[PDB]
Amino acid sequence: DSSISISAIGNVDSPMIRITFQNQTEREFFLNKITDKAKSLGVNISTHPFEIKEPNMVLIKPSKYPDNKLGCYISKNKEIAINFGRTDFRDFVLSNLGVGSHLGTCPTKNETGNDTFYFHQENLSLNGPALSVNT
């Protein structure tokens, strides 16, 4: 069992993604991948938006202009959105979480929102039930 749980949590102003792994080693495996990828793309994730929490969790913290462009926010049509800075970084993170593009909207490379994933409302809502991926 290497399943991952994904929830949207918090409040409208400060929404976050909670990613829960089966154990700390699986969490570390994921983190190593994304930190390695971000550095190559020049996306600065040194302290934002990912943050570990005990046990077994990685949070994606809120975006907040001007402090931080990356992170979670509620879109204008009430979808849970995540800004990843660069389209290749978005695609990499989603793939390595087992979040298929069919679960939301993933604007392509040269489109507005190319850096962002939006979950369909029916798939994920704020303080709603979790999704199980990589099952």
CSV table of N, CA, C and O in Angstrom, one decimal:
chain,number,residue,atom,x,y,z
A,1,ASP,N,0.8,-1.2,0.0
A,1,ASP,CA,0.0,0.0,0.0
A,1,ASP,C,0.9,1.3,0.0
A,1,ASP,O,1.5,1.6,1.0
A,2,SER,N,0.8,2.0,-1.1
A,2,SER,CA,1.6,3.2,-1.3
A,2,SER,C,0.7,4.4,-1.6
A,2,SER,O,1.1,5.4,-2.1
A,3,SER,N,-0.6,4.3,-1.2
A,3,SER,CA,-1.6,5.3,-1.5
A,3,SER,C,-1.3,6.6,-0.8
A,3,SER,O,-0.6,6.7,0.2
A,4,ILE,N,-1.8,7.7,-1.5
A,4,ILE,CA,-1.7,9.1,-1.0
A,4,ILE,C,-3.0,9.7,-0.8
A,4,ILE,O,-3.9,9.4,-1.7
A,5,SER,N,-3.3,10.4,0.2
A,5,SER,CA,-4.5,11.1,0.5
A,5,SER,C,-4.3,12.6,0.2
A,5,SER,O,-3.2,13.2,0.6
A,6,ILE,N,-5.2,13.3,-0.5
A,6,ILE,CA,-5.1,14.7,-0.8
A,6,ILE,C,-6.4,15.3,-0.3
A,6,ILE,O,-7.5,14.9,-0.7
A,7,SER,N,-6.3,16.4,0.5
A,7,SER,CA,-7.4,17.2,1.0
A,7,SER,C,-7.1,18.7,0.8
A,7,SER,O,-6.0,19.1,0.8
A,8,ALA,N,-8.2,19.4,0.6
A,8,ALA,CA,-8.1,20.9,0.7
A,8,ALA,C,-8.6,21.3,2.0
A,8,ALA,O,-9.7,20.9,2.5
A,9,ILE,N,-7.8,22.1,2.7
A,9,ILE,CA,-8.1,22.4,4.1
A,9,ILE,C,-7.9,23.9,4.4
A,9,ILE,O,-7.3,24.7,3.6
A,10,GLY,N,-8.5,24.4,5.5
A,10,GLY,CA,-8.2,25.7,6.0
A,10,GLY,C,-9.4,26.7,5.9
A,10,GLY,O,-10.5,26.3,6.2
A,11,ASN,N,-9.1,27.9,5.4
A,11,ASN,CA,-10.2,28.8,5.2
A,11,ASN,C,-10.0,29.5,3.8
A,11,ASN,O,-9.0,29.3,3.1
A,12,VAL,N,-11.0,30.3,3.4
A,12,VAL,CA,-11.1,30.8,2.0
A,12,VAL,C,-9.8,31.7,1.7
A,12,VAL,O,-9.2,31.6,0.6
A,13,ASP,N,-9.5,32.5,2.7
A,13,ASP,CA,-8.3,33.4,2.6
A,13,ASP,C,-7.0,32.6,2.6
A,13,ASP,O,-6.1,33.0,1.9
A,14,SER,N,-6.9,31.6,3.4
A,14,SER,CA,-5.7,30.7,3.6
A,14,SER,C,-6.0,29.3,3.4
A,14,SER,O,-6.1,28.5,4.4
A,15,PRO,N,-6.3,28.8,2.1
A,15,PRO,CA,-6.5,27.4,1.8
A,15,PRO,C,-5.2,26.7,1.6
A,15,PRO,O,-4.3,27.3,1.1
A,16,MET,N,-5.2,25.4,1.9
A,16,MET,CA,-4.0,24.6,1.7
A,16,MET,C,-4.3,23.3,1.2
A,16,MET,O,-5.5,22.8,1.3
A,17,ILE,N,-3.4,22.6,0.6
A,17,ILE,CA,-3.5,21.2,0.3
A,17,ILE,C,-2.8,20.4,1.4
A,17,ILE,O,-1.6,20.7,1.7
A,18,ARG,N,-3.4,19.4,1.9
A,18,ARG,CA,-2.8,18.4,2.8
A,18,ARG,C,-2.6,17.1,2.0
A,18,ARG,O,-3.5,16.5,1.6
A,19,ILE,N,-1.3,16.7,1.9
A,19,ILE,CA,-0.9,15.5,1.2
A,19,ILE,C,-0.4,14.5,2.3
A,19,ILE,O,0.5,14.9,3.0
A,20,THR,N,-1.1,13.4,2.4
A,20,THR,CA,-0.6,12.4,3.5
A,20,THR,C,-0.1,11.1,2.8
A,20,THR,O,-0.8,10.5,2.0
A,21,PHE,N,1.1,10.7,3.2
A,21,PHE,CA,1.8,9.5,2.7
A,21,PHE,C,1.6,8.4,3.7
A,21,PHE,O,1.2,8.6,4.9
A,22,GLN,N,1.9,7.2,3.3
A,22,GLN,CA,1.8,6.0,4.1
A,22,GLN,C,2.8,6.0,5.3
A,22,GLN,O,2.5,5.4,6.4
A,23,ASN,N,4.0,6.6,5.0
A,23,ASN,CA,5.1,6.6,6.0
A,23,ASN,C,6.0,7.7,5.6
A,23,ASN,O,5.9,8.3,4.5
A,24,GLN,N,7.0,7.9,6.5
A,24,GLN,CA,8.0,9.0,6.3
A,24,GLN,C,8.9,8.8,5.1
A,24,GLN,O,9.3,9.8,4.5
A,25,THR,N,9.2,7.6,4.8
A,25,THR,CA,10.1,7.2,3.7
A,25,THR,C,9.5,7.6,2.4
A,25,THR,O,10.1,8.1,1.5
A,26,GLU,N,8.2,7.2,2.2
A,26,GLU,CA,7.5,7.6,1.0
A,26,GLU,C,7.4,9.1,0.8
A,26,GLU,O,7.5,9.6,-0.3
A,27,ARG,N,7.2,9.8,2.0
A,27,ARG,CA,7.1,11.2,1.9
A,27,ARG,C,8.5,11.8,1.5
A,27,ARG,O,8.5,12.7,0.6
A,28,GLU,N,9.6,11.3,2.0
A,28,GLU,CA,10.9,11.8,1.7
A,28,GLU,C,11.2,11.5,0.2
A,28,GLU,O,11.9,12.3,-0.4
A,29,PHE,N,10.8,10.3,-0.3
A,29,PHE,CA,11.0,9.9,-1.7
A,29,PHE,C,10.3,11.0,-2.6
A,29,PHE,O,11.0,11.4,-3.6
A,30,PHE,N,9.1,11.4,-2.3
A,30,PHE,CA,8.4,12.4,-3.0
A,30,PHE,C,9.2,13.8,-3.0
A,30,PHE,O,9.4,14.4,-4.0
A,31,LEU,N,9.5,14.2,-1.7
A,31,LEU,CA,10.2,15.5,-1.5
A,31,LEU,C,11.5,15.6,-2.3
A,31,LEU,O,11.8,16.6,-2.9
A,32,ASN,N,12.3,14.5,-2.2
A,32,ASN,CA,13.6,14.5,-2.9
A,32,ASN,C,13.4,14.7,-4.4
A,32,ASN,O,14.1,15.5,-5.0
A,33,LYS,N,12.4,14.1,-5.0
A,33,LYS,CA,12.1,14.2,-6.4
A,33,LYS,C,11.7,15.7,-6.8
A,33,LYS,O,12.3,16.2,-7.7
A,34,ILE,N,10.8,16.3,-6.0
A,34,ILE,CA,10.3,17.6,-6.3
A,34,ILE,C,11.4,18.7,-6.1
A,34,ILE,O,11.4,19.7,-6.8
A,35,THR,N,12.2,18.6,-5.0
A,35,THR,CA,13.2,19.5,-4.7
A,35,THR,C,14.3,19.5,-5.8
A,35,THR,O,14.7,20.6,-6.3
A,36,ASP,N,14.6,18.3,-6.3
A,36,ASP,CA,15.6,18.1,-7.4
A,36,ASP,C,15.1,18.7,-8.7
A,36,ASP,O,15.8,19.4,-9.4
A,37,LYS,N,13.8,18.5,-9.0
A,37,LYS,CA,13.2,19.1,-10.2
A,37,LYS,C,13.1,20.6,-10.1
A,37,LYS,O,13.4,21.3,-11.1
A,38,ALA,N,12.6,21.2,-9.0
A,38,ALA,CA,12.4,22.6,-8.8
A,38,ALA,C,13.8,23.4,-9.0
A,38,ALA,O,13.8,24.4,-9.7
A,39,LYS,N,14.8,22.8,-8.5
A,39,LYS,CA,16.2,23.4,-8.6
A,39,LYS,C,16.6,23.5,-10.1
A,39,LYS,O,17.1,24.6,-10.5
A,40,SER,N,16.4,22.5,-10.8
A,40,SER,CA,16.7,22.5,-12.3
A,40,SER,C,15.9,23.5,-13.1
A,40,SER,O,16.4,24.0,-14.1
A,41,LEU,N,14.7,23.7,-12.7
A,41,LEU,CA,13.8,24.7,-13.4
A,41,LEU,C,14.0,26.1,-12.9
A,41,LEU,O,13.4,27.0,-13.4
A,42,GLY,N,14.7,26.3,-11.8
A,42,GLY,CA,14.9,27.6,-11.2
A,42,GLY,C,13.7,28.1,-10.4
A,42,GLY,O,13.5,29.3,-10.2
A,43,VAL,N,12.8,27.1,-10.0
A,43,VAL,CA,11.7,27.4,-9.2
A,43,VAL,C,12.1,27.4,-7.7
A,43,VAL,O,12.5,26.3,-7.3
A,44,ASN,N,12.0,28.5,-7.0
A,44,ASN,CA,12.4,28.6,-5.6
A,44,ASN,C,11.4,28.1,-4.6
A,44,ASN,O,10.5,28.8,-4.3
A,45,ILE,N,11.6,26.8,-4.2
A,45,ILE,CA,10.7,26.2,-3.2
A,45,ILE,C,11.4,26.0,-1.9
A,45,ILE,O,11.1,25.2,-1.1
A,46,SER,N,12.5,26.8,-1.6
A,46,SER,CA,13.3,26.7,-0.4
A,46,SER,C,12.4,26.7,0.8
A,46,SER,O,12.6,25.8,1.7
A,47,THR,N,11.4,27.6,0.9
A,47,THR,CA,10.5,27.6,2.1
A,47,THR,C,9.0,27.7,1.8
A,47,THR,O,8.2,27.6,2.7
A,48,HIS,N,8.7,27.7,0.5
A,48,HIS,CA,7.3,27.9,0.1
A,48,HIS,C,7.2,27.3,-1.3
A,48,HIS,O,8.1,27.4,-2.1
A,49,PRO,N,6.0,26.6,-1.6
A,49,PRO,CA,4.8,26.4,-0.8
A,49,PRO,C,4.8,25.1,0.0
A,49,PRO,O,3.8,24.9,0.8
A,50,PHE,N,5.7,24.2,-0.1
A,50,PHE,CA,5.7,22.9,0.5
A,50,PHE,C,6.3,23.0,1.9
A,50,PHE,O,7.3,23.6,2.2
A,51,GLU,N,5.6,22.4,2.9
A,51,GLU,CA,6.0,22.3,4.3
A,51,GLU,C,5.6,21.0,4.9
A,51,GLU,O,4.5,20.6,4.7
A,52,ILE,N,6.6,20.3,5.5
A,52,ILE,CA,6.2,19.0,6.1
A,52,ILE,C,5.5,19.2,7.5
A,52,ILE,O,5.7,20.2,8.2
A,53,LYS,N,4.7,18.2,7.8
A,53,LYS,CA,4.0,18.2,9.1
A,53,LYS,C,4.0,16.8,9.6
A,53,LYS,O,3.8,15.8,8.8
A,54,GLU,N,4.1,16.6,10.9
A,54,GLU,CA,4.2,15.3,11.5
A,54,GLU,C,2.8,14.8,12.0
A,54,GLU,O,2.0,15.5,12.6
A,55,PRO,N,2.5,13.5,11.6
A,55,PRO,CA,3.3,12.6,10.8
A,55,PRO,C,2.9,12.5,9.4
A,55,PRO,O,1.7,12.7,9.1
A,56,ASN,N,3.8,12.3,8.5
A,56,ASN,CA,3.6,11.8,7.1
A,56,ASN,C,2.9,12.8,6.2
A,56,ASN,O,2.5,12.4,5.1
A,57,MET,N,2.9,14.1,6.5
A,57,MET,CA,2.2,15.1,5.7
A,57,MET,C,3.1,16.0,5.0
A,57,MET,O,4.2,16.3,5.5
A,58,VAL,N,2.7,16.5,3.9
A,58,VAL,CA,3.3,17.6,3.2
A,58,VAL,C,2.1,18.6,2.9
A,58,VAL,O,1.1,18.2,2.3
A,59,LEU,N,2.2,19.8,3.4
A,59,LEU,CA,1.2,20.8,3.1
A,59,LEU,C,1.7,21.6,1.9
A,59,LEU,O,2.9,21.9,1.7
A,60,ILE,N,0.7,22.1,1.0
A,60,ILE,CA,1.0,23.1,0.1
A,60,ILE,C,0.3,24.3,0.6
A,60,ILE,O,-1.0,24.4,0.7
A,61,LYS,N,1.1,25.3,1.0
A,61,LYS,CA,0.6,26.5,1.7
A,61,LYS,C,0.0,27.5,0.7
A,61,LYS,O,0.1,27.3,-0.5
A,62,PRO,N,-0.7,28.5,1.3
A,62,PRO,CA,-1.5,29.4,0.4
A,62,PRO,C,-0.6,30.3,-0.4
A,62,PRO,O,0.5,30.7,0.0
A,63,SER,N,-1.0,30.6,-1.6
A,63,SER,CA,-0.5,31.8,-2.3
A,63,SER,C,-0.9,33.0,-1.6
A,63,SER,O,-2.0,33.0,-0.9
A,64,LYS,N,-0.2,34.1,-1.7
A,64,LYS,CA,-0.5,35.4,-1.1
A,64,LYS,C,0.3,36.5,-1.7
A,64,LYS,O,1.5,36.6,-1.5
A,65,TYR,N,-0.4,37.3,-2.5
A,65,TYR,CA,0.3,38.4,-3.2
A,65,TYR,C,0.5,39.6,-2.2
A,65,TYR,O,-0.4,39.9,-1.4
A,66,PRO,N,1.8,40.1,-2.1
A,66,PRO,CA,2.9,39.9,-3.0
A,66,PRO,C,3.9,38.9,-2.4
A,66,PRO,O,4.9,38.6,-3.1
A,67,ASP,N,3.7,38.4,-1.2
A,67,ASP,CA,4.6,37.5,-0.5
A,67,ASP,C,5.0,36.3,-1.2
A,67,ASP,O,6.2,36.0,-1.3
A,68,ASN,N,4.1,35.6,-1.8
A,68,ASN,CA,4.3,34.4,-2.5
A,68,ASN,C,3.3,34.1,-3.6
A,68,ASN,O,2.1,34.1,-3.3
A,69,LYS,N,3.8,33.9,-4.8
A,69,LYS,CA,2.9,33.6,-5.9
A,69,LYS,C,2.6,32.1,-6.0
A,69,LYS,O,1.5,31.8,-6.5
A,70,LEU,N,3.5,31.3,-5.5
A,70,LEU,CA,3.2,29.8,-5.5
A,70,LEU,C,2.3,29.4,-4.4
A,70,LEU,O,2.3,30.1,-3.4
A,71,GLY,N,1.5,28.4,-4.6
A,71,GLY,CA,0.7,27.8,-3.6
A,71,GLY,C,-0.8,27.7,-3.9
A,71,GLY,O,-1.2,27.9,-5.1
A,72,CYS,N,-1.6,27.4,-2.9
A,72,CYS,CA,-3.0,27.1,-3.0
A,72,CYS,C,-3.8,28.3,-2.9
A,72,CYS,O,-3.5,29.2,-2.1
A,73,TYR,N,-4.9,28.4,-3.7
A,73,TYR,CA,-5.9,29.4,-3.6
A,73,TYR,C,-7.2,28.9,-4.1
A,73,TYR,O,-7.3,27.9,-4.8
A,74,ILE,N,-8.3,29.7,-3.8
A,74,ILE,CA,-9.6,29.4,-4.3
A,74,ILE,C,-9.8,30.2,-5.5
A,74,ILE,O,-9.7,31.5,-5.4
A,75,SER,N,-10.2,29.6,-6.6
A,75,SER,CA,-10.4,30.3,-7.9
A,75,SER,C,-11.7,31.0,-7.9
A,75,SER,O,-12.5,30.9,-7.1
A,76,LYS,N,-11.9,31.8,-9.0
A,76,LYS,CA,-13.1,32.7,-9.1
A,76,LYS,C,-14.4,31.9,-9.2
A,76,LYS,O,-15.5,32.5,-8.9
A,77,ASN,N,-14.3,30.7,-9.7
A,77,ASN,CA,-15.4,29.8,-9.8
A,77,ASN,C,-15.4,28.7,-8.7
A,77,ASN,O,-16.1,27.6,-8.8
A,78,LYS,N,-14.7,29.0,-7.6
A,78,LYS,CA,-14.7,28.1,-6.4
A,78,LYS,C,-14.1,26.7,-6.6
A,78,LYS,O,-14.5,25.7,-6.0
A,79,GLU,N,-13.0,26.7,-7.4
A,79,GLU,CA,-12.2,25.5,-7.6
A,79,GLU,C,-11.0,25.7,-6.7
A,79,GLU,O,-10.4,26.8,-6.5
A,80,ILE,N,-10.5,24.6,-6.2
A,80,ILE,CA,-9.2,24.5,-5.5
A,80,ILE,C,-8.1,24.6,-6.5
A,80,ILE,O,-8.0,23.7,-7.4
A,81,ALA,N,-7.3,25.6,-6.5
A,81,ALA,CA,-6.2,25.8,-7.4
A,81,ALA,C,-4.8,25.8,-6.7
A,81,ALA,O,-4.7,26.1,-5.6
A,82,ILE,N,-3.8,25.4,-7.5
A,82,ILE,CA,-2.4,25.4,-7.0
A,82,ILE,C,-1.6,26.0,-8.1
A,82,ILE,O,-1.5,25.5,-9.2
A,83,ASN,N,-0.9,27.1,-7.7
A,83,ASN,CA,0.1,27.7,-8.6
A,83,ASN,C,1.5,27.1,-8.3
A,83,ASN,O,2.0,27.1,-7.2
A,84,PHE,N,2.1,26.5,-9.4
A,84,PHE,CA,3.4,25.8,-9.3
A,84,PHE,C,4.6,26.6,-9.9
A,84,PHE,O,5.7,26.1,-10.1
A,85,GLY,N,4.3,27.8,-10.4
A,85,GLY,CA,5.3,28.7,-11.0
A,85,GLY,C,5.7,28.4,-12.4
A,85,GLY,O,5.8,29.4,-13.2
A,86,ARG,N,5.9,27.2,-12.8
A,86,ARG,CA,6.3,26.8,-14.1
A,86,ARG,C,5.5,25.5,-14.5
A,86,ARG,O,5.3,24.6,-13.7
A,87,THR,N,5.1,25.5,-15.8
A,87,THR,CA,4.2,24.3,-16.3
A,87,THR,C,4.9,23.0,-16.1
A,87,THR,O,4.2,22.0,-15.7
A,88,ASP,N,6.2,22.9,-16.4
A,88,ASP,CA,6.9,21.6,-16.2
A,88,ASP,C,7.0,21.2,-14.7
A,88,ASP,O,6.9,20.0,-14.5
A,89,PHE,N,7.0,22.1,-13.8
A,89,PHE,CA,7.0,21.8,-12.4
A,89,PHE,C,5.6,21.3,-12.0
A,89,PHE,O,5.5,20.3,-11.3
A,90,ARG,N,4.6,22.0,-12.4
A,90,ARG,CA,3.2,21.5,-12.2
A,90,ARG,C,3.0,20.1,-12.6
A,90,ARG,O,2.6,19.2,-11.9
A,91,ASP,N,3.4,19.9,-13.9
A,91,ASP,CA,3.1,18.6,-14.5
A,91,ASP,C,3.9,17.5,-13.8
A,91,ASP,O,3.4,16.4,-13.5
A,92,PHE,N,5.1,17.8,-13.3
A,92,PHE,CA,6.0,16.8,-12.6
A,92,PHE,C,5.4,16.5,-11.2
A,92,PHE,O,5.3,15.3,-10.8
A,93,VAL,N,4.9,17.5,-10.5
A,93,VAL,CA,4.4,17.3,-9.2
A,93,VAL,C,3.1,16.5,-9.3
A,93,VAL,O,3.0,15.5,-8.5
A,94,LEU,N,2.2,16.8,-10.2
A,94,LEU,CA,1.0,16.1,-10.3
A,94,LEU,C,1.2,14.6,-10.7
A,94,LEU,O,0.6,13.7,-10.1
A,95,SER,N,2.1,14.4,-11.6
A,95,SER,CA,2.4,13.0,-12.1
A,95,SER,C,3.0,12.2,-10.9
A,95,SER,O,2.6,11.0,-10.8
A,96,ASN,N,3.8,12.8,-10.1
A,96,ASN,CA,4.5,12.1,-9.0
A,96,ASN,C,3.6,11.9,-7.7
A,96,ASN,O,4.0,11.3,-6.8
A,97,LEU,N,2.4,12.5,-7.8
A,97,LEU,CA,1.4,12.3,-6.8
A,97,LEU,C,0.3,11.4,-7.3
A,97,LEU,O,-0.6,10.9,-6.5
A,98,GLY,N,0.3,11.1,-8.6
A,98,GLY,CA,-0.7,10.3,-9.2
A,98,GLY,C,-2.0,11.0,-9.4
A,98,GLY,O,-3.1,10.4,-9.4
A,99,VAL,N,-2.0,12.3,-9.6
A,99,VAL,CA,-3.1,13.2,-9.9
A,99,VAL,C,-3.2,13.3,-11.4
A,99,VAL,O,-2.5,14.1,-12.0
A,100,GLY,N,-4.1,12.6,-12.0
A,100,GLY,CA,-4.4,12.7,-13.4
A,100,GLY,C,-5.0,14.0,-13.8
A,100,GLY,O,-5.8,14.6,-13.1
A,101,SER,N,-4.7,14.5,-15.0
A,101,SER,CA,-5.2,15.7,-15.6
A,101,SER,C,-6.7,15.7,-15.6
A,101,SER,O,-7.4,16.8,-15.5
A,102,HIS,N,-7.3,14.6,-15.8
A,102,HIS,CA,-8.8,14.4,-15.9
A,102,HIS,C,-9.5,14.8,-14.6
A,102,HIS,O,-10.7,15.0,-14.6
A,103,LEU,N,-8.7,15.0,-13.5
A,103,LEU,CA,-9.3,15.4,-12.2
A,103,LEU,C,-9.6,16.9,-12.1
A,103,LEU,O,-10.1,17.4,-11.2
A,104,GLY,N,-9.1,17.6,-13.2
A,104,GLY,CA,-9.3,19.1,-13.2
A,104,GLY,C,-9.0,19.7,-14.5
A,104,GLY,O,-9.2,19.2,-15.6
A,105,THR,N,-8.4,20.9,-14.4
A,105,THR,CA,-8.1,21.7,-15.6
A,105,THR,C,-6.6,22.0,-15.5
A,105,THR,O,-6.1,22.6,-14.4
A,106,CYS,N,-5.9,21.8,-16.6
A,106,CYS,CA,-4.5,21.9,-16.7
A,106,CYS,C,-4.1,22.7,-17.9
A,106,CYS,O,-3.8,22.1,-19.0
A,107,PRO,N,-4.2,24.0,-17.9
A,107,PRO,CA,-3.9,24.8,-19.1
A,107,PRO,C,-2.5,24.4,-19.7
A,107,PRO,O,-1.6,24.3,-18.9
A,108,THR,N,-2.5,24.3,-21.0
A,108,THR,CA,-1.2,23.9,-21.7
A,108,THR,C,-0.2,25.0,-21.6
A,108,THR,O,-0.4,26.1,-21.2
A,109,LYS,N,1.1,24.6,-22.0
A,109,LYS,CA,2.3,25.3,-21.9
A,109,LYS,C,2.2,26.8,-22.1
A,109,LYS,O,2.8,27.6,-21.3
A,110,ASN,N,1.6,27.2,-23.2
A,110,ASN,CA,1.5,28.6,-23.6
A,110,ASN,C,0.2,29.3,-23.4
A,110,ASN,O,0.0,30.5,-23.8
A,111,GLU,N,-0.7,28.7,-22.6
A,111,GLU,CA,-2.0,29.2,-22.2
A,111,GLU,C,-1.9,30.0,-20.9
A,111,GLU,O,-1.0,29.7,-20.1
A,112,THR,N,-2.8,30.9,-20.7
A,112,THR,CA,-2.9,31.5,-19.4
A,112,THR,C,-3.2,30.4,-18.4
A,112,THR,O,-4.1,29.6,-18.7
A,113,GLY,N,-2.6,30.5,-17.2
A,113,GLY,CA,-2.7,29.4,-16.2
A,113,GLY,C,-1.9,28.2,-16.5
A,113,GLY,O,-2.1,27.2,-15.8
A,114,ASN,N,-0.9,28.3,-17.3
A,114,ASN,CA,0.0,27.2,-17.7
A,114,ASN,C,0.8,26.7,-16.4
A,114,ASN,O,1.3,25.6,-16.4
A,115,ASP,N,0.8,27.5,-15.4
A,115,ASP,CA,1.6,27.2,-14.2
A,115,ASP,C,0.7,26.6,-13.1
A,115,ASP,O,1.1,26.3,-12.0
A,116,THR,N,-0.6,26.4,-13.4
A,116,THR,CA,-1.6,26.2,-12.4
A,116,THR,C,-2.5,24.9,-12.7
A,116,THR,O,-2.7,24.6,-13.8
A,117,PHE,N,-2.8,24.2,-11.6
A,117,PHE,CA,-3.8,23.1,-11.7
A,117,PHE,C,-5.0,23.5,-10.9
A,117,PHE,O,-4.9,24.1,-9.8
A,118,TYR,N,-6.2,23.3,-11.5
A,118,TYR,CA,-7.5,23.5,-10.9
A,118,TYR,C,-8.2,22.2,-10.7
A,118,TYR,O,-8.5,21.6,-11.7
A,119,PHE,N,-8.5,21.8,-9.5
A,119,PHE,CA,-9.4,20.6,-9.3
A,119,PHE,C,-10.8,20.9,-9.7
A,119,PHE,O,-11.3,22.0,-9.4
A,120,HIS,N,-11.5,20.0,-10.4
A,120,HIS,CA,-13.0,20.2,-10.5
A,120,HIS,C,-13.6,20.2,-9.1
A,120,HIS,O,-13.2,19.5,-8.2
A,121,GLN,N,-14.6,21.1,-8.9
A,121,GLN,CA,-15.3,21.3,-7.6
A,121,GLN,C,-15.8,20.0,-7.1
A,121,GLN,O,-15.8,19.7,-5.9
A,122,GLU,N,-16.4,19.2,-8.0
A,122,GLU,CA,-17.0,17.9,-7.6
A,122,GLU,C,-15.9,16.9,-7.2
A,122,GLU,O,-16.3,15.8,-6.6
A,123,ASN,N,-14.6,17.1,-7.5
A,123,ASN,CA,-13.6,16.3,-7.0
A,123,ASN,C,-12.9,16.7,-5.7
A,123,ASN,O,-12.4,15.8,-5.0
A,124,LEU,N,-12.9,18.0,-5.4
A,124,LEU,CA,-12.2,18.5,-4.2
A,124,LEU,C,-12.8,19.8,-3.8
A,124,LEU,O,-12.9,20.7,-4.6
A,125,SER,N,-13.2,19.9,-2.6
A,125,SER,CA,-13.7,21.1,-2.0
A,125,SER,C,-13.0,21.4,-0.7
A,125,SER,O,-12.5,20.5,0.0
A,126,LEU,N,-13.1,22.7,-0.3
A,126,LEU,CA,-12.5,23.2,0.9
A,126,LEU,C,-13.1,22.5,2.1
A,126,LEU,O,-14.3,22.6,2.4
A,127,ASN,N,-12.3,21.8,2.9
A,127,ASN,CA,-12.7,21.1,4.1
A,127,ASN,C,-13.6,19.9,3.8
A,127,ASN,O,-14.3,19.4,4.7
A,128,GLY,N,-13.6,19.5,2.5
A,128,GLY,CA,-14.4,18.3,2.1
A,128,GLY,C,-13.6,17.1,2.3
A,128,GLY,O,-12.5,17.1,2.8
A,129,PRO,N,-14.2,15.9,1.9
A,129,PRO,CA,-13.5,14.7,2.0
A,129,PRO,C,-12.2,14.6,1.1
A,129,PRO,O,-12.1,15.4,0.2
A,130,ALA,N,-11.3,13.7,1.5
A,130,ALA,CA,-10.1,13.5,0.8
A,130,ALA,C,-10.2,12.7,-0.5
A,130,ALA,O,-11.2,11.9,-0.6
A,131,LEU,N,-9.3,12.9,-1.4
A,131,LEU,CA,-9.1,12.0,-2.5
A,131,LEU,C,-8.0,11.0,-2.2
A,131,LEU,O,-7.0,11.4,-1.7
A,132,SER,N,-8.2,9.7,-2.6
A,132,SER,CA,-7.2,8.7,-2.6
A,132,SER,C,-6.6,8.5,-3.9
A,132,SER,O,-7.3,8.2,-4.9
A,133,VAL,N,-5.3,8.8,-4.1
A,133,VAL,CA,-4.6,8.5,-5.3
A,133,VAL,C,-3.4,7.6,-5.1
A,133,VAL,O,-3.0,7.3,-4.0
A,134,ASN,N,-2.8,7.1,-6.2
A,134,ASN,CA,-1.8,6.0,-6.2
A,134,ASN,C,-2.2,4.8,-5.4
A,134,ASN,O,-1.4,4.3,-4.6
A,135,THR,N,-3.4,4.3,-5.6
A,135,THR,CA,-4.0,3.2,-4.9
A,135,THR,C,-3.7,1.9,-5.7
A,135,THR,O,-3.4,1.9,-6.9
